[PDB]
Amino acid sequence: PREIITLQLGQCGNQIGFEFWKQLCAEHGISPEGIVEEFATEGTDRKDVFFYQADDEHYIPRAVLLDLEPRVIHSILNSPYANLYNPENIYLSEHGGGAGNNWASGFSQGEKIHEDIFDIIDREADGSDSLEGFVLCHSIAGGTGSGLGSYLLERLNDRYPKKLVQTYSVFPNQDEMSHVVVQPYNSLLTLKRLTQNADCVVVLDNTALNRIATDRLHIQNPSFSQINQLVSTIMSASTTTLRYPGYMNNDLIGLIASLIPTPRLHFLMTGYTPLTTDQSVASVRKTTVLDVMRRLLQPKNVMVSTGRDRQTNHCYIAILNIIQGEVDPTQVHKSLQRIRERKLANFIPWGPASIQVALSRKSPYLPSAHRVSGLMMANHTNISSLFERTCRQYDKLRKREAFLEQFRKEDIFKDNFDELDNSREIVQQLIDEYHA
Amino acid sequence: PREIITLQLGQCGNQIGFEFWKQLCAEHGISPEGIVEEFATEGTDRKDVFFYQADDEHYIPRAVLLDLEPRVIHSILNSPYANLYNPENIYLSEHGGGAGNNWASGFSQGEKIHEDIFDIIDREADGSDSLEGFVLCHSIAGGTGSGLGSYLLERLNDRYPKKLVQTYSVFPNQDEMSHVVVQPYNSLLTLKRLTQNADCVVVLDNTALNRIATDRLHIQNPSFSQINQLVSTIMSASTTTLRYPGYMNNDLIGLIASLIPTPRLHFLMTGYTPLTTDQSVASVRKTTVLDVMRRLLQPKNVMVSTGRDRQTNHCYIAILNIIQGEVDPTQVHKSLQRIRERKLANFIPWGPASIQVALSRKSPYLPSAHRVSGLMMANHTNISSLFERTCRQYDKLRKREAFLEQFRKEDIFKDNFDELDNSREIVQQLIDEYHA
Amino acid sequence: SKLMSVCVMFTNCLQRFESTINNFDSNFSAHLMDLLDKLSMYSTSDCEHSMINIIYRLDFNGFY
Amino acid sequence: IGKSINFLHQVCHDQTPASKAMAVGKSAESPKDAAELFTDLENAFQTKIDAAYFDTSKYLLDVLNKNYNLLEHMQAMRRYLLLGQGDFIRHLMDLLKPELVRPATTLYQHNLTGILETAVRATNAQFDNPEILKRLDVRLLEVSPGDTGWDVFSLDYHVDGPIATVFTRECMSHYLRVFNFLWRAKRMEYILTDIWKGHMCNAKLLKGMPELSGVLHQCHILASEMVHFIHQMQYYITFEVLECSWDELWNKVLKAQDLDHIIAAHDVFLDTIISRCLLDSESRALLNQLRAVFDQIIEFQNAQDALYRAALEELQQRLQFEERKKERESETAAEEDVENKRIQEFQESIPKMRSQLRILTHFYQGIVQQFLVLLTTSTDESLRFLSFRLDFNEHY
């Protein structure tokens, strides 16, 4: 009983959460409609911890999908994955809302559909004997997921302040501003609520997702279907201590405690190397373990945009290196002999750092019985490069005179704008003070 | 023998025993035109208690059906079980009807059909060699079953003082007052005869009923025929230690005496798990039998609605949990380890409580030869809230200045209106004083 | 047998219709002072599998 | 052969080595022997004995796998007292915690077996079917109830059947010693999560007060220096030794079809692991410094939620008098005075929270530096491996 409730929210958050539930059946080796193999219970030792308990021989997701954009949720019930979602423990079919790519649209839809959002994750949090937490499958992209996503960052942390809250926030694309223009306003609003009513988050940058999406997956046109590939893999990978076997840090709130070092600095960086098209051509020369954390040490796998001149004036505190699949574990300490010699990762020389490595076996799946997959969950204190960027794209836009009255047309008839800026330079200053 | 003659009475009261008989033939695998099948003697060695003993080798239910609406009995006399029913021991075929839907109408028509009302239960009770008792499956819904059902609550507990008097009481809707407005007068007049002219009641709620009809079973818009489906299932489920063989407490006046000190506290809350109809094909491979008898104690399926915060300020005194079908009887003591372990039920600490656990075998028939079924007959003291709702709905209707003369048409020519107010307020205190 | 004697003694009293009822309570309280010595007579073995089921039913006996 | 003849007794099958070709063989052999002249086998002795030695070693690897599989059972005990799988034991010890907090009772035994048994049924539907749970029992101590009672609850793998042919008395007694260090590591993994949630519980509840916001902020740092040091030492010293001993023994009893190599892998197994865990008669300097840190992080622990609860409850009496200020406006110098007492009870409660924290870290500085020296001296064992492991926590 370490049950986690997913809150799939927004136009981009339903799509990243679709390929995450669809990924789980493909590795348990089963049909999304049922149990067709014994690898669902022999391979995943522990059957259900993201699904409600069995009384029909089916694994029914613990997902709520509320959105003000109905196209994305209509791409679920005409998908051949509409035999995984059973509507009666998930949601009532069709959920409508505002226009509404504004932050103030999804933010008000949380206050008049207030009855259903606080009556749908509590009809699904009553079977649990003790709740683990909430994963906010919400986005900063769009106003549907950033508006509704900003409300639940408060109300889940005054009612359940002990439960894990943690969002997979993906920023809206920062090399364009020709499809979204409300981007500096809605990002800073969620980040304030993240800095004083939050436990841990896992944030990613969308321009650093798309640098990998064209360098490993080898497409010439970035498309929001190749960007969602990176997010379903690292979601299912972080909890292969819990849902899949583990021992040390077997709770996902075990792993995450040593990735929280002090309030408002616990924004965890994600890295995941093996994605290449020909990753599977290295089983002719030995799928070795003598390079599977020299590729997690080598800096070229970042989903956070950050300089290479920030790797000698910042220092890591906690670094997680999860190796997955077959591994031959009697040479994994031999590989860890070798991390300290290159020093392409630094340590704070005033306090302790910790280099956690762990391995876990998985259900028959080609990426985890013939291939080595490495998830890094870093906590590097160079994360202030996104926070300064979000702030410079904000302070230039208020001088153009935009959204200081072009924003006050839905439930904002007061000022609160300099409350987000002032808090934001304290976060960057308290990050920068914490290493020397 | 222990033959009970059932007294179906009222327009609604007659329909809730009708669909009770259609269940009984289908599970003995008998044919409706007498016993013609050999599964009757080989399969189970007793089935009589509601069936008239052989003297022709054809069986007639021990039923009497009297009403002031012959309209309810024509929904029984056009059905092709009108050759299963043999009308000359049930009623003198094509009995007339009354005015009639006043409580005082059927109450005054009992005292000039005084001769016939005490012979039509003698021509249905002349085959027994020592009669056990009478169950009045009357109804409080409408003034036809309540009107005539009040008469038989008095003359059957003093012209047979040794026989068991017990009713399956069903209420009419307590949200509405436009489907029956005469509801606070007839309810309190019949509750009054239950606390000085009966020993046991069975309280079934109509407003928690349709709450279960949209929950586990799902109906698009509420329908006035649900009332006879939810009620008839718990009727054939309740007598399975006196139809089918038991062991301990096979005497019904043994279970009911361990339920009730005395009338003035006798209002039984019913709970019945199998209402999920996917549970029924997931019990081939075992659904866990350890939690299916803990969802009765907490409200997921109770048919009596009572406070969901007054379950820890009030105490159970007697709670019965009858398991039916498979359970594996040697892991029934493994489930009974866990009832005491949580202490979901609060108990009386001055003196003995009772955790009544009972189990029973069934007649061969696959939806009751492999399914996990739990029936609760509780006696919790928080039952004072329904009588506080009914009583507050009576004083308020009399302060509108009505049914104080627009109701004194037959047999009430005197003041006894404040006698039902004091006798209900007497009851509401004596339950609560019984626990310390 | 003594609890049965208070049972027929109580059906006799309801047929005949103070000091009488207290004599009822001492006979029910006579079986509670006995059940209290039973819990220590049941727990005393030297432990193994057979006795721990026998104390387990008797703890449910006082609980009932 | 004398050993393998005692072991076929134990098991169901009692048969002449593998083939029934041994019953022809005895009958040929006595007359054959008699038909020899004046010579007798003296170098042909080696062909007779070595082929037969090979014959009842291949009857042996059959008896081990055909009934009552011992080798799966070698793995089955590792899950319940070498705790090879955490998701089993963490799902026990979450439901066990409200029971372990209260001292031991005389009704303590009968009910924990039904809490244990419902819960190993709840996390498995493929390892429930093998009889490993009817081959699993409880172990309780003779420890007089004068302790919380957490070292008391222990699982033992109970045998006395054919599985107890390969096991000795001397084996599970040493497995008691390996349980108690491992039970306290996995206890420390969970009691430090609870108090982490208590930093984050109370913090959401002191909002409206700018002072106590930053007070918890530094305390969250000083806790981390103990949490991160416990994690990289306790998790990593045990996982490595668990790895080196599971890989020593389990791939040596199905790589050898003899009996004397089975026992030879087993009696080197159980005494390599405890010397790197807790105990022996040289590693007595190890556990003196691993228990000194074990009780200072509890001494750090109870002062937190004894002041953190007070940090959140004192603002609740401050707040409810502000909700009372508008009811007087609908239906005041002395009212400011009680606000000044709340502001004083906050004013007080901050150097209290500071000073106890400075007394705790001066106690932790003394354990951690004494923890270094008495692990970096000692002789007649490999200290080069232990000084590799501890210099790895301090520099990296």
Side-chain angles (χ1 to χ4, degrees), chain A residues 157-379:
Chain A
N157 300 286
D158 49 16
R159 282 180 69 203
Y160 311 89
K162 303 185 178 58
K163 285 45 180 187
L164 167 70
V165 173
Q166 184 183 82
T167 177
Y168 293 90
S169 274
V170 279
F171 290 106
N173 217 244
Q174 313 205 40
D175 289 328
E176 310 175 73
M177 198 77 97
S178 73
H179 62 282
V180 55
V181 64
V182 57
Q183 141 174 347
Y185 270 70
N186 60 22
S187 63
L188 227 61
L189 285 154
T190 318
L191 283 163
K192 173 172 169 70
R193 310 287 188 283
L194 275 188
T195 50
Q196 61 218 244
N197 304 293
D199 177 15
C200 212
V201 286
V202 175
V203 291
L204 317 83
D205 194 35
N206 183 213
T207 55
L209 278 181
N210 296 22
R211 58 125 304 226
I212 326 186
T214 64
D215 182 32
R216 296 293 199 178
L217 322 180
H218 268 298
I219 76 199
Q220 303 62 61
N221 174 224
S223 58
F224 194 62
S225 51
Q226 289 311 117
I227 302 165
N228 292 37
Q229 292 289 328
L230 308 182
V231 176
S232 63
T233 36
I234 64 87
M235 283 168 97
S236 71
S238 68
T239 195
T240 58
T241 45
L242 168 53
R243 188 189 53 233
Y244 268 115
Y247 189 35
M248 296 294 205
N249 299 331
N250 67 258
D251 276 359
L252 175 67
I253 68 162
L255 275 181
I256 280 304
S258 217
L259 284 163
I260 278 175
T262 180
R264 47 174 52 163
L265 161 50
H266 49 62
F267 309 81
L268 301 195
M269 297 185 46
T270 306
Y272 192 105
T273 302
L275 279 157
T276 331
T277 52
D278 302 342
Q279 181 65 234
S280 69
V281 307
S283 50
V284 304
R285 62 73 170 188
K286 169 76 175 156
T287 299
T288 186
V289 74
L290 302 181
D291 70 342
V292 301
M293 54 177 83
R294 276 205 308 180
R295 83 177 54 180
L296 311 178
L297 175 62
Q298 196 198 96
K300 197 61 150 64
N301 59 327
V302 301
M303 301 177 180
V304 162
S305 69
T306 194
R308 303 300 189 202
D309 66 319
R310 300 186 46 105
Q311 298 216 77
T312 191
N313 301 348
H314 302 97
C315 299
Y316 304 86
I317 182 150
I319 171 75
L320 191 74
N321 287 141
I322 302 284
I323 182 64
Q324 297 164 82
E326 183 161 288
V327 53
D328 199 3
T330 196
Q331 312 177 46
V332 180
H333 57 83
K334 200 169 172 59
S335 301
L336 177 53
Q337 198 51 33
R338 317 172 57 198
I339 295 299
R340 72 205 185 97
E341 287 326 302
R342 292 299 208 179
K343 316 193 173 60
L344 299 185
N346 294 150
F347 309 120
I348 52 174
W350 57 272
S354 64
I355 305 168
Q356 298 317 109
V357 69
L359 46 94
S360 54
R361 60 256 73 173
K362 286 175 68 55
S363 185
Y365 189 59
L366 298 156
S368 55
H370 159 273
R371 201 62 263 154
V372 277
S373 308
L375 185 63
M376 189 188 77
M377 194 66 54
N379 198 154

Side-chain angles (χ1 to χ4, degrees), chain D residues 39-282:
Chain D
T39 202
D40 213 7
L41 43 70
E42 299 198 89
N43 47 348
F45 170 80
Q46 170 67 23
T47 43
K48 285 290 162 76
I49 186 68
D50 72 333
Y53 163 106
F54 195 71
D55 181 15
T56 205
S57 62
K58 76 178 47 173
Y59 183 71
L60 200 72
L61 63 93
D62 293 346
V63 161
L64 293 182
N65 195 250
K66 64 196 194 189
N67 60 5
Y68 302 96
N69 65 357
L70 304 81
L71 49 156
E72 296 291 359
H73 286 218
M74 288 292 203
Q75 204 187 98
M77 58 161 186
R78 290 189 213 108
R79 278 177 165 136
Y80 288 120
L81 35 75
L82 191 31
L83 271 59
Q85 171 69 256
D87 298 333
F88 293 171
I89 224 72
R90 202 60 180 285
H91 293 16
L92 292 189
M93 173 163 36
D94 180 355
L95 296 177
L96 250 293
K97 151 170 184 58
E99 198 214 284
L100 287 169
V101 79
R102 47 190 175 85
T105 39
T106 203
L107 31 80
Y108 200 73
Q109 193 177 74
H110 59 248
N111 71 322
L112 42 89
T113 50
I115 308 295
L116 163 47
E117 279 209 308
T118 189
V120 289
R121 151 157 183 194
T123 191
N124 292 142
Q126 74 306 322
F127 195 87
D128 189 4
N129 306 81
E131 280 192 74
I132 301 291
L133 314 176
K134 259 67 56 173
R135 213 62 183 276
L136 191 81
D137 288 334
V138 296
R139 178 174 56 199
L140 307 184
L141 298 159
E142 73 293 300
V143 166
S144 49
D147 64 327
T148 44
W150 275 86
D151 55 3
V152 179
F153 165 76
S154 276
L155 293 175
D156 65 351
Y157 198 66
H158 198 115
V159 299
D160 54 339
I163 312 287
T165 300
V166 74
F167 288 144
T168 176
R169 301 322 307 172
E170 311 299 301
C171 129
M172 57 269 308
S173 47
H174 275 188
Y175 293 167
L176 182 42
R177 310 288 61 207
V178 93
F179 182 99
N180 289 6
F181 175 62
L182 204 44
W183 180 271
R184 295 167 181 104
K186 287 286 311 312
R187 195 203 297 197
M188 286 166 81
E189 175 180 313
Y190 193 12
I191 57 156
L192 277 288
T193 303
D194 211 0
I195 195 63
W196 201 254
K197 298 325 187 157
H199 288 87
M200 297 293 196
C201 174
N202 73 301
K204 315 294 174 291
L205 305 183
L206 61 77
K207 307 305 292 169
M209 176 59 47
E211 293 182 35
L212 301 180
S213 179
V215 155
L216 90 93
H217 176 282
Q218 52 83 44
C219 186
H220 217 317
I221 300 168
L222 270 314
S224 297
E225 166 176 68
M226 306 191 187
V227 169
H228 281 63
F229 198 66
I230 290 315
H231 296 189
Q232 61 193 293
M233 181 281 280
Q234 291 277 349
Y235 298 164
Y236 186 65
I237 67 196
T238 289
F239 187 76
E240 163 64 8
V241 170
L242 167 159
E243 206 64 64
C244 76
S245 61
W246 188 307
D247 309 348
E248 183 58 86
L249 156 73
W250 192 86
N251 59 19
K252 180 64 188 302
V253 301
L254 36 73
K255 299 315 300 207
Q257 53 292 296
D258 295 341
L259 33 91
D260 42 64
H261 296 356
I262 317 295
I263 189 48
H266 172 71
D267 74 338
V268 83
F269 157 74
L270 79 166
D271 59 3
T272 49
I273 175 164
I274 190 64
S275 64
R276 312 283 66 197
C277 291
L278 197 69
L279 181 58
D280 185 6
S281 297
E282 209 66 72

